[model samples]
Target: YDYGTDTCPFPVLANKTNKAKAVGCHQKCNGGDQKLTDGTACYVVERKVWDRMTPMLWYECPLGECKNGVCEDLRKKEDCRKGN
Candidate 1:
């Protein structure tokens, strides 16, 4: 997970394969308990311990948003305005 720009105390899961497997947090790309399948990769961010310590923040991509290697935000906008 790229926490360089923003910090996500909460966990986020990324599934790269069709199968689901139990995993832990902070597991490296290839260090997770289960191997990443064609469509099964998991990314996690844990919830913050205290809101006062650090405010929660989310990433915003005007052109696109990539989650678990899947681009969604951009695709939705494009699909919605296809005929416009």
Candidate 2:
């Protein structure tokens, strides 16, 4: 099917300009945040910052806990050098 070089599927193909960064095709989080089969949950950080225009990226809860569908205890660590 030449899927390796194929354009993004369907609506994403018609709606966007950057086919390379489109998440509509080959998406792992098509239904939004997902909980793994092992009971670990994940969410998309980029979506909150960029909507659908950014790449689809999944990250575990910042504090390693997914409570009520929200990342919890996302406190900034004081162990590292602060950088802007």
Candidate 3:
């Protein structure tokens, strides 16, 4: 594992089936793990650590679905809404 590097040493590991990713660091997307609470936007459900290596496990799409590593509503209608 590499560290203290500005960029990811190798290509970011991503899983299309599991909806997970192993990157060099967090905040690369929109913080380590975050999800929209309205419906099922997506967010990191768990954060793991092994010694000094900080590997972002991944985020969960919740009720929604994962698209391109991001959580998005797959339903015909929009589940996430804004402005009350």
Candidate number of the best lDDT: 3
User: What does candidate 3's lDDT look like per residue over 1-84, in tens digits?
Assistant: 433332422223333444422221232322233222233233222223222223344322223343444435444321221111
List candidate 2 segments past 4 Å from native.
1-46, 50-64, 77-84
Q: CA lDDT of each candidate?
A: 0.27, 0.27, 0.30
Expressed as tens digits, the lDDT of each residue in 1-84 for candidate 1 is 433322322233223334322222232433332222333322222223211222233322123333443322333211111100
Ranking by TM-score: 2, 3, 1
Give the least accurate 10-residue stretch of model 2, judged by summed lDDT: 11-20
Residue 75 of model 2 has an lDDT of 51
lDDT of 2 at 72: 39
Local error of candidate 3 at 72, Å?
A: 1.6
- Per-residue error for 2 in candidate 1, Å, reads 31
Question: Model 2 Cα displacement at 84 (Å)?
Answer: 23
Q: How far is candidate 3 from the true structure (C-alpha RMSD, Å)?
A: 13.0
How much is the lDDT of residue 52 in candidate 1? 25
Better of 1 and 3 by TM-score: 3
Q: What's the true lDDT of residue 45 in model 1?
A: 21
